[PDB]
Curated annotation (Swiss-Prot), chain A:
Gene label: rpoA
Signal peptide: none
Enzyme class: transferase
GO MF term (any one): protein dimerization activity
Keyword line: DNA-directed RNA polymerase, Nucleotidyltransferase, Transcription, Transferase
Protein name: DNA-directed RNA polymerase subunit alpha
Recorded GO CC terms: cytoplasm; DNA-directed RNA polymerase complex
One Gene Ontology biological process: DNA-templated transcription
Annotated family: Belongs to the RNA polymerase alpha chain family.
Function: DNA-dependent RNA polymerase catalyzes the transcription of DNA into RNA using the four ribonucleoside triphosphates as substrates.
Swiss-Prot record, chain B:
Record function comment: DNA-dependent RNA polymerase catalyzes the transcription of DNA into RNA using the four ribonucleoside triphosphates as substrates.
Family under the similarity heading: Belongs to the RNA polymerase beta chain family.
Protein name: DNA-directed RNA polymerase subunit beta
Included range, full protein: 1088 to 1137 of 1383
Subunit structure: The RNAP catalytic core consists of 2 alpha, 1 beta, 1 beta' and 1 omega subunit. When a sigma factor is associated with the core the holoenzyme is formed, which can initiate transcription.
């Protein structure tokens, strides 16, 4: 066997190359890797947000344009990467006209915001905005009702997925002292959270600890 | 003497046992909620939802 290489076509989507494998290993290995990568990979997402001047998620906030709850819906698309942490509180502040981007928030030293140019809302009047939000981590996907007294705190569904789609296809290799070898590549499109090689390493570690029930 | 009215707001989720139809005239009920890793997928990587 040989260690996998990686080609970087795009900074958000990479691909790994695994070679060589015997007959009957490549299809089941790619299927198991796709199943583990799309089943449960731990990442970070948003949690319940404590908003200052908004009572509940159906009011009319002054200065902010055209929505209240759709700001909370569009705030789920941000990417959170943390180093040695599982709970962090962030808060943003903006005043005056202009749009509100994801990079305009006040982050921590370890908390880094990926693709911060994503739009959140729009401010049309000279007003303040302070939304204190939390970041939790876990595995799989948990809704708002399964996780959970202050009336000023609103719940929000946590749907973390560091990868979006994983595809793979086998091909024919070229080794002289044999007849055919199964060479395969794996397309991994991540949402700016974790690298594709580290995702492959964590998926292989999860499958190795899952295959320890027999030995 | 006194009459009060309280307005509630409930977000209805999607669950097995819900009737859902199309525009071409194919009415039916939903069956199961399968995870995305156990769904058919094309050569590009797009997973079929329905």
């Amino acid at each position: 066997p040989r260690g996998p290489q990686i080609e970087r076509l795009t900074d958000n989507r990479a691909k790994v190359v695994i070679e060589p494998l015997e007959r009957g290993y490549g299809h089941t290995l790619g299927n198991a890797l796709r199943r583990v990568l799309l089943s449960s990979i731990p990442g970070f997402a948003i949690t319940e947000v404590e908003i200052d001047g908004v009572l509940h998620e159906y009011t009319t906030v002054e200065g902010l344009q055209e929505d209240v709850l759709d700001v909370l819906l569009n705030l789920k698309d941000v990417a959170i990467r943390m180093h040695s942490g599982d709970s962090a509180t962030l808060s943003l502040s903006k005043q005056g006209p202009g749009t509100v981007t994801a990079a305009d928030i006040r982050t921590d030293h370890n908390v880094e915001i990926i693709n911060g140019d994503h739009v959140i809302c729009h401010l049309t009047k000279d007003t303040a905005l302070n939304m204190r939000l939390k970041i939790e981590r876990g595995f799989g996907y948990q809704p708002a009702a399964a996780r959970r007294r202050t009336i000023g705190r609103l719940m929000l569904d946590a749907s973390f997925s560091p990868v979006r789609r994983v595809a793979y296809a086998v091909e024919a290799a070229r080794v002289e002292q044999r007849t055919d070898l199964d060479k395969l590549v794996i397309d991994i499109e991540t949402n700016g959270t974790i690298d594709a090689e580290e995702a492959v390493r964590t998926a292989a570690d999860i499958l190795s600890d899952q295959l320890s029930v027999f030995g | 003497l006194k009459m009060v009215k309280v307005f509630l707001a409930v977000k209805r989720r999607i669950q097995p046992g819900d009737k859902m139809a199309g525009r071409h005239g194919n009415k039916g009920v939903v069956s199961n909620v399968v995870p995305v890793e156990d769904m058919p997928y094309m050569a590009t990587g797009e997973s079929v939802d329905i």
